[PDB]
Specification:
homodimer, mainly beta, Cathepsin D, subunit A, domain 1, 8-stranded mixed β-sheet, 6 helices, binds ligand C39, peptidase activity (chain A), insulin-like growth factor receptor binding (chain A), aspartic-type endopeptidase activity (chain A)
Chain lengths: 331, 333
């Protein structure tokens, strides 16, 4: 019976990473926990000094984990934000309390933009075996294997910028949501994607009636749409593009409509407050939105994806055993 | 025997963790610190001259309202690492969460404003052993233990990342809703004090410091992790932080990059990443955020020691096991 709770760090509301320890003795890295992919990886005490990205991070030393059993496979993880390439090996990862012996990637090649913007070191994928590049069996399907935690559900709390945020493997941590869940169902097992039958703005449904797809990605900073969805949405908030990104001007952020994401029956609404990055109400300044365009490519893509922005407002729970997702007001 | 009481605590800015005791019949309630570095109990006294303006700003024990107060009057002076208080003895019934003890305590009559003008708590409930209690005033935990009440002769401290309950002490056990993983116990070097042998602090990668060994008192009534000036400043050299008089300070936009500090308590490696020890009020180029580790030299009564205060208890649930004279740490949640 377990609830293993991993406490997270909220770095500027653009990224929340918590920590695993790998090896015996454990070597701890800060990692993001990603429901949009399935492979666990950390940098290697091997990663080329010329990837400022290796240099900078923390690096796994395969020769200090007594328990380490190498394997070899050149792994190539193409992520929607950049592609890392390393080689596969085995050790003991400690998650919270739990201890799983898990094959992971040792990243060797690591392309600086963006993993040097990564304030973290690696990713644990809470995704599916079906997404796992090279059928390496993911940590949750594997922790599940040993049968220790008490429900195979795991949930995410992301806090506003303090606690920071937590993952609870085994159930929900009830102090951080209010009311009871209402679940939405996976379209097909293999992805934590669900169906939005619309995105409204204030009142009027603007797009995505005759619904479009929703990836629920905990390893994502924002709400994302296709360039042109996001276009029409910005176009309606009044928000305008500055150079990179869209802004609105701070004193007017109170004015903006709500977006409402109609997920299966219910409506998950977000106010200006939840999506405008409000460093003041100054009349004299521009304030960024936390909704962003990002083209996800088509295995998985092209899809809208609900990352941190959504999850700060709604506690999410990933009900692995019923292949569905729950949401409740987070607090 | 069998009982567990739990005291609840209020967390003021991860710096002050105070709970509340009731002394007297009727009870005068006082906000106090449950301190494992000292072993006397004291509260400000009605007789404190209000020229000490800490006594103007605190709540005082007016002993002519307790029907139970038993005079005793021996003066004692309490010399803490941060400042000294002086006063005399008294006896009355203190309540420490449900449990009731008659207890000899100090009525403090001279309370120097620095640093107690700065303290949200009114007094101290020393949780140490009798070998460090000034004047042998048999410590509150030995009194509850002679009462035959508790399920186990242990107390546990849970200090919470501030922001709903601030923390919780359990008397007689350990609450497994605030720890995960298994306990890890480190034995005491001597009986008399909650101090354990520690070998090597690691900044980032290599055992930078306390290589061969040094002591670590695990003091719940202290906000920071302390180390000897002669040793912290080298740790501080490495982290590259600045001295600003009483604390250390780093340019705020560095914080979230500063290398993990690791502690080697008795056979495992307890580790703080840079959230754990950095008071991130900003991510600016300007603004200096404060590191929550700073130097301070505990005097050689209790050796010169590293003191592991609320920055470590905040991550590892601590069970002070008096019964086997050892301290166990586990993960907090
Ligand atoms: C198996 C190959 C992946 C297939 N699936 C995908 O690519 C999904 C569309 C999305 C994918 O999971 C995506 N979440 C990956 C993320 C993206 N991370 C970054 O690119 C990243 C780098 C620097 C700074 C921030 C970044 O995002 C962190 C967001 C997490 O904080 C909540 C991983 C690497 C932590
Ligand atoms: C029995 C006499 C032995 C004295 N020995 C010692 O001085 C010990 C080594 C340290 C001692 O435990 C020390 N921690 C005492 C504490 C320290 N507190 C303060 O100095 C202090 C003053 C103002 C504001 C806060 C302070 O710290 C409280 C921190 C507790 O919150 C976790 C007392 C005065 C409440």
């Amino acid at each position: 019976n377990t609830t293993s709770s991993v406490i997270l760090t909220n770095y500027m509301d653009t990224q929340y990473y918590g920590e695993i320890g790998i090896g015996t003795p454990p070597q701890t890295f800060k990692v993001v926990f990603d429901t949009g992919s399935s492979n666990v990886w950390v940098p290697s005490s091997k990663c080329s000094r010329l990837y400022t990205a290796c240099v900078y991070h923390k690096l796994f030393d395969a020769s200090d984990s007594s328990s380490y059993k190498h394997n070899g496979t050149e792994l190539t993880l193409r992520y929607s934000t950049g592609t890392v390439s390393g080689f596969l090996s085995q050790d003991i990862i400690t998650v919270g309390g739990i201890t799983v012996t898990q094959m992971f990637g040792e990243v060797t090649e690591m392309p600086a933009l963006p993993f040097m913007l990564a304030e973290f070191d690696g990713v644990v994928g809470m995704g599916f075996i079906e997404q796992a590049i090279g059928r390496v069996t993911p940590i949750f399907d594997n922790i599940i294997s040993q049968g220790v935690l008490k429900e195979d559900v795991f949930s995410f709390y992301y806090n506003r910028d303090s606690l920071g945020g937590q993952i609870v493997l085994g159930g929900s941590d009830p102090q951080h949501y209010e009311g009871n869940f209402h679940y939405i169902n996976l379209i097909k097992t293999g992805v934590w994607q669900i169906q939005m039958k619309g995105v409204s703005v204030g009142s009027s449904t603007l797009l995505c009636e005759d619904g479009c797809l929703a990836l629920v990605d905990t390893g994502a900073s924002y709400i994302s749409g296709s360039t042109s969805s996001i276009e029409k949405l910005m176009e309606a908030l009044g928000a305008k593009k500055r150079l990179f990104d869209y802004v609105v001007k701070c004193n007017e952020g109170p004015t903006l409509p709500d977006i409402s994401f109609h997920l299966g029956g219910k409506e998950y609404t977000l106010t200006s407050a939840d999506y405008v990055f409000q460093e003041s109400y100054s009349s004299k300044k521009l304030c960024t939105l936390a909704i962003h365009a990002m083209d996800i490519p088509p295995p998985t893509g092209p899809t809208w994806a609900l990352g941190a922005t959504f999850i700060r407002k709604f506690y999410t729970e990933f009900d692995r055993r019923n292949n569905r997702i729950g949401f409740a007001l987070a607090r």
